[PDB]
Symmetry: C3
Subunit: 502 residues, 3 copies
């Protein structure tokens, strides 16, 4: 009949989050020690497992699209797409990228130059290796799991007339038991990872936004200021989701996506243009040359440390935690397309903007720390990673206008990403109605207030190292579910191949 709540999933997913969020708020000092102890345990005990499973998804989705299965339509064999490609291409940006592109664009390459994982720092191979780790952390591996989840969700819904849910890919394995205890756990385990990923993103955004106001006006860094920042950021995203406007939203996304390109072009043409163009091509070459061996590097013959638990394993856990939300969002606007076209669009359209942004913005700061002798900019990336971007931007013409534009652009990016997150969260916990509409409207408020509570709890207990620990701990049970879904999809493809010739 009508849409409603799926109680076995809601209660399971909501009793974990609300119990975790109170222990961290009532005991901030005991929680920051245990989360710091678990982060060093994970890097040494389950570090190889993440590196092993992140490559399987990419190899699977590439081999599938290059083979003869890339001819299968994502609907019936005679229906057509519903969007202009232009409107398809632009809807991937709004959901994929967020405010954390401003937090890591300058301070992360300056950290790998002064403290490399192997070698001696401050030289010319440290820079070449740091701009390569930066391409690895934002490249094909991350966009390859989004495409996997999206393809698996669209295939079982538009060809087999099954619900749009994570458990439908287990149908070739257990049949009608996707409506029992086994299928409800798969759906409850996929909400916890999403909540923790969104919380980490929102916490990094609060930290980035608190420094711009300090630079411009003089607002202090206080615990009661961050509460108001969280309130503003989340109340501006709940009221856009419960208001039922999509024209103004998708029209405002595109405006922000043009201002982003204007800012990128200003930064490119107001600096060393030829140096930046040369380093762009150099970085592309280095990444493609070292890809097949950097996928398994764990620095096993060096002296033991905990570098891996804060940089690469964190990134693999973070992309896995964001996969359920972006996959179900891209599956809804891809009916009528073939597998090859879908995969090669998702892998290459949002990646070219991200890698260009990262290259230009990181090389602009490396060039000024190495060649112009600006050491207070590189020392800031270690003690205060939230102020490095403004220290770089204050060396440009009309510096107090570019910063005021950057603050606004960054706020709008976060709003247009959180607004789409709450809708998908309310859909993953509903049941019934038409298989093209979203869940009830009282669940968006609930799943927004829950994320606000989690973020508030995790920042006031350990800052940046607590978010990275919670994500790595909570993304573990969903990787095995992804492997099971891969098995089910492979088992469906063989019945496809037999049925086309028999």
């Amino acid at each position: 009949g009508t849409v409603r709540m799926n109680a076995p999933v809601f209660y399971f997913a909501a009793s974990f989050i609300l119990i975790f969020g109170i222990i961290v708020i009532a005991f901030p000092q005991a929680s920051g020690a245990w989360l710091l102890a678990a982060q060093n345990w994970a890097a040494n005990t389950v570090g190889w497992y993440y590196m092993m499973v992140m490559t399987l998804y990419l190899v699977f989705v590439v081999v599938t699209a290059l083979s003869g299965f890339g001819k299968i339509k994502l609907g019936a064999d005679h229906d057509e797409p519903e969007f202009s490609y232009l409107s398809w291409a632009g809807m991937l940006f709004a959901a994929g990228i967020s405010i954390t592109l401003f937090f890591f664009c300058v301070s992360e390459p300056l950290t790998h130059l002064l403290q490399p994982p192997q070698g001696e720092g401050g030289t010319a191979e440290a820079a070449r290796q740091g701009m390569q780790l930066l391409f690895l952390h934002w490249g094909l591996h991350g966009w390859g799991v989004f495409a996997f989840v999206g393809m698996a969700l669209a295939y079982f819904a538009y060809r087999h007339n099954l619900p749009l849910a994570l458990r439908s890919a287990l149908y070739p394995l257990i049949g009608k038991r996707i409506n029992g205890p086994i299928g409800y756990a798969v759906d409850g385990f996929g909400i916890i990872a999403t909540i923790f990923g969104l919380g980490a993103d929102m916490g990094f955004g609060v930290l980035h936004l608190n420094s711009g106001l300090d630079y411009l006006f003089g607002v202090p860094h206080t615990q009661w200021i961050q509460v108001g920042l969280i309130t503003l950021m989340m109340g501006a995203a709940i009221l856009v989701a419960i208001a039922g406007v999509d024209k103004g939203v998708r029209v405002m996304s595109d405006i922000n996506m043009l201002l982003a390109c204007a800012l990128l072009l200003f930064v490119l043409f107001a600096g060393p243009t030829q140096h930046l163009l040369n380093t762009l091509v150099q970085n592309i070459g280095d990444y493609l040359g070292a890809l097949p061996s950097k996928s398994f590097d764990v620095y096993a013959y060096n002296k033991p440390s905990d570098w891996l638990g804060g940089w690469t394993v964190f990134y693999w856990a973070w992309w896995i935690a964001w996969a359920p939300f972006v996959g179900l969002f891209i599956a809804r606007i891809s009916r009528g397309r073939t597998i090859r076209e879908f995969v090669f669009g998702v892998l290459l359209i949002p990646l070219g903007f991200t890698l260009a942004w990262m290259s230009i913005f990181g090389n602009s700061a490396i060039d000024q720390v190495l060649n112009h002798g600006m050491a207070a900019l590189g020392q800031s990336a270690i003690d205060d990673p939230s102020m490095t971007l403004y220290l770089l931007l204050e060396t440009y013409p009309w510096s107090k206008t570019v910063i005021a534009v950057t603050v606004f652009i960054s706020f709008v990016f976060f709003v247009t990403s959180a607004d789409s997150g709450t809708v998908v969260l309310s859909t993953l916990s509903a049941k019934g109605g038409n298989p093209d509409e979203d869940g009830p409207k009282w669940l968006r408020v609930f799943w927004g207030v829950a994320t606000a509570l989690i973020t508030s709890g995790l920042l006031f207990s350990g800052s940046i190292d607590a978010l990275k620990s919670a994500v790595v701990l909570t993304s573990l049970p969903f990787s095995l579910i992804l492997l099971l879904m891969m098995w089910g999809l492979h088992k469906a493809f063989v019945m496809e191949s037999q049925r086309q010739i028999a």
Copy 2:
């Protein structure tokens, strides 16, 4: 009618072996000098040729299986396989691996660390490079020639109704002349290589077995002890081949293959587990990253030496010499399968166990020579490579029980490999009867006593450097025959492509 002897092949193959084996036994001092002189000549004169031809086989078999020819059945287009995959897979282990997996697992990586082919020894890149040479010597190159010979033998026998012989792949080139002087030389040249490969394997096994008894009881290393060891090892394998039991044999193989995994798991869980898991993933990454360039490395710009004639060219000659026996064994249990399924089973099922064994066992010893300061273990790999495994195993709990189990497991491995070798040897020199049965039973005894004689002659004249020289010298005329067979197979595939469209 009935099976019988193929006299033109038997006399040609038996007059070379019996004449070679008496000269070495009657003149042990003059034979050890000439075999040592030939080993340094070969490494410099025909070293590039082996590296050039070993890559052709692998590229051929991979491109064939990835193309549209991978759809062709290895029988008629409507018959089905005869085995359970489980029993097909387990039968590849029994024939492929032997007792020499215990002789090289610990002492070879410890040799590449203290005496690298390029660089300075005892450091942390010497270990990373040695564990990469070890993966190259036991990886895809060796299992890629087995698959080539097996596919070529099954194709011409189950689709064109030709004999199961090495000369049938020359039919598209010379027609009915495979039953004349040209086809008999091709079959006689393939028995000599097999005999010398088996002799080298048996000699390394005698050396490995003589040290365990010294460690346990106190048996000396004497020339009259090795004669009794050879007698026991070969008399235990002739009586299993002339007795006509396959249930008890294939059932005892599987028992030994479970004890091997139990021993591997004990060694993994009784040591530094996390270090070993990390180094496993690191080794996989390093091998896959350096594969396309290490295929042609001959160290040509360095100072001249003879490193290549004892390590890499020896391994290429040894795999080529073992190809005729394993190919005809795997061709008999693969009727009804497609080319792609056969190739991707043979390349990946027996390789994962071998590479895991090598990685775990080599890293366990590198970790204890570098980090725990055990120099008498690394000095033993240079002066006495037969005692290094026991020196490593004596640092574990209950050390005198694990060694007594290892000795037994190693003896059973050799027996289940030699038993299958003699049957195929008696088949390669027979003619007539049904094309699913084996040759007469008086030829198994003959080809076993011949191998015993060759091994006895080669050990008492130069020990380990004489076996490596004889193999490299006697595997030269069979590589050209393999190239001719590749030409014939390519010429048959084009007549396949037309007939499917005309």
Copy 3:
């Protein structure tokens, strides 16, 4: 009706060349400074663009031949080839290779050893890196653009019944407007690049030929001697083109192509044969291992210099400038073949001879500068690159006969390449008649005298650095036309794919 002149193309292409050629002859001192200033500007401003576009052509032609489009015939689906493969294979040599193979074979690897682009010179990694740059500069990248132009020209002429011209590949974009102002500029811009490439080749040939006569007889290096050398070289190639003989020409080509192999075998067997064979395999391995990363190397993190504008960007501009002449020559003898067969013949038949020549001749000189202490041979590659080959050849048996043979072979190579250039140049500026015949005979004389004038002007103003600058400056507007042609070909392939299933 009959063939005639295409005046809008002729006047456009002939007013640029004749105006450029007089300014350089009337002002030799002011022209050598501006051409030297432009060479350093280009290396820094448009260096990344050439590296970016040269890889697109290769990736396009490889992916096209490996896909299902490699089955399309280059004519009608039922006609057969017209040549014997033997006469097809041999006609690619005569047009592809020229006299500049003798100018760079010895002096270029000796320059990269003593002045590497990165590192320290005179050691054993400088040699390994120089023999790798030499393989990059004469390998797959250059032969991959020839195949692209040839395939694009044959496809639109033998399947769609369009003229054999460069503008026919713009038909899917603008239709009947290929016979107006847009199509005439595309054809006029393709003659200027060809003229400048031919001029550079002829200038290097004059320099190489002037030193052999100095060595043999004692002819000085004078400005009035080079005028006579140019007169002889070009008058011997106009009289072969206006005489109408192809049997004697294609028959004399094959004779020269046998003398070349005889000379290569003499040089291989009169020196260190085993060292040379080992280094050949080593070079193949190094090139294939470093190919996917050396395609984007611009040395961006090193100290700024102008190395790129004289070595790699010059080579990319030179191959692009030679593409229009060789593409239209190979398109005329390839009717009836499939795309895959054409591409894999062009990529692999002329490349194996070139890479073997380069390897043997460069390693013969590296081995004698490093190991035998011959420093006057390596100092000559810096101050006088035209005399290095004779200094190397004078250390062989019967040295005054090999040099007299080399001079003749080099002269005949240039003649058989220029003779075919003038015919294609007269065809690119004609219109009418049968689409299998060549243009009028008064245009061959014109386009030969024009090249002579350009060469005379560019050598008397800056020698070797002026040719390299003119080529890099004049090959810029044709790369964009090549991109447009790629777009048109892709747009035609999709109408192929739809029409085979509908």
